[PDB]
Amino acid sequence: EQLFGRQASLSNPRVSLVANSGTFVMDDGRKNHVPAYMVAVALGGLASGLEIG
Amino acid sequence: AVEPFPRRPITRPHASIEVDTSGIGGSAGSSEKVFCLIGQAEGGEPNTVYELRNYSQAKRLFRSGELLDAIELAWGSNPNYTAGRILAMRIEDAKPASAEIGGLKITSKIYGNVANNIQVGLEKNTLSDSLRLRVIFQDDRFNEVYDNIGNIFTIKYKGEEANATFSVEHDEETQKASRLVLKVGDQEVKSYDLTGGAYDYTNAIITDINQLPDFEAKLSPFGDKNLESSKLDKIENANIKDKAVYVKAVFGDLEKQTAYNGIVSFEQLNAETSPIKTIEPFELTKLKGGTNGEPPATWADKLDKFAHEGGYYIVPLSSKQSVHAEVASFVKERSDAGEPMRAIVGGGFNESKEQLFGRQASLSNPRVSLVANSGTFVMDDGRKNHVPAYMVAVALGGLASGLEIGESITFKPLRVSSLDQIYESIDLDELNENGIISIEFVRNRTNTFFRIVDDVTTFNDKSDPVKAEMAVGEANDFLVSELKVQLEDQFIGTRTINTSASIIKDFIQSYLGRKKRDNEIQDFPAEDVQVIVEGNEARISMTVYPIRSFKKISVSLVYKQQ
Description:
Chain A is built from two helices and two strands; from the N terminus they run αββα. By secondary structure, the first copy, chain A, is an alpha+beta fold. The longest helix of chain A is centred in the C-terminal third of the chain and has 14 residues. The radius of gyration of chain A is 14 Å and the shape is flat. In chain A, 0% of the residues are buried. The interface between A and B is small, with 4 and 3 residues. Chain A: It comes from Staphylococcus phage 812. Chain A: This is Major tail sheath protein.
């Protein structure tokens, strides 16, 4: 519902809203539990690597 | 014709798999020609012709009936000679079912007695001052629900002034409500006529109201609501300073969403110049008045519907002699008009050969062939059905549709499980000599076949193959028709500045030579062509030898010593 609240406030094709939050295992073996905007980086880093098509 | 069903909109990318007793069934194969059928059939629009490419569409639209069984025979009779595309129209003049409750006239997209099993109802959503809808079609178990119906956006006035009022006016001449005015403290800021122009959409109104420093119009997230302004509802003096003032288009929201329902159409009840009966919640109630009607005494109007459709083969699923005459007259008309066709007919169970001769005596036409045998077929789901001849006629029609133009149905096998009567050699000869097409049984060491003995039309004379053998006549038919239409395009259709008789003669000879190079025709006389031109008209005459098939073999044996 809060996600829909953000959707209600914001509806723009130039932006996408990610909902899930999780944890990542990183260098040195440390695993960090992080908010969604860190997941957003993973989506952004992925999309950056993918080709245009 | 019309390919009725477009895509279903989808929501998510996924793969789903579900066990079932039955599959998707047959499929239309590549074909030069098209196959037309008429018969008893539940579902679909009466007096409308539908094109089918797959058995799934036939199930989805022609929900049940002997017609749907006929399609299965057409594509299931032989995988090698699978029948081509299909044109179908239901004989029964079914009716829709209707419900008129709660300010709404509700009618069924489905036509027939099934339509009365549709239930639709509205409910009041106390949580958001809105109406709610549910649609259930119990036979197909199709359940649909809509919520927050009618409410688009909310307005709040934020200033300290005593009173803010929201008003919408009504036009009685057309029953529309096309004004929306915001007033605060007996002073007006703006007024939006909802009759197009400046504020055609509610989107602009929301933008307009939001610009006002003392107001905010906020979009409801429950369902896309960008309706045109004219669809807003009658509203009279709503206090904008309060917690929430709703802007409502009850029918407009219903009109958009309900268009996507697969079962129902909605109309807004006019009272019985009468004002609008208010759309209000009501119990989920059955639709009523949907029936199958009765078939017409004459099928001529139905057959006239197929003119200019290109279906070479047409089969009526009936045994009535008068109906057969109607088709024969209709086919005769189309052939002269420039649309050649062939009709396949067969009536009743185990009908007497004398009665077959009675039909032959009444009817002798090269454009039609009469099938005598009746039998039973094993079909999908393991059910085996014992059926009249006109269902066998479909198998012949479906077979002939799959075969190439130059190849006859003669002697080809058939999958029919069994036949009512097993004609003897003499019995078969009498039928074939009298222009009756029949089925023959043979037995291998451990195999059994049902074969089509030969191609013969009701026309009896053996003198002219084109009259007798439909395969030969069909080859001539497609040859001429394909030639003329091409010729029309080059000279009549396309802008031609000049033309001579000899030029036409060369073009004709070029066309025929190409056919021989494709093996479509075996031989012909090159010098026999004639061309005459007379003002705006030209006469063309030519001859081509029909193909001859292999019929008789006689053998004798001699035993000897050593």
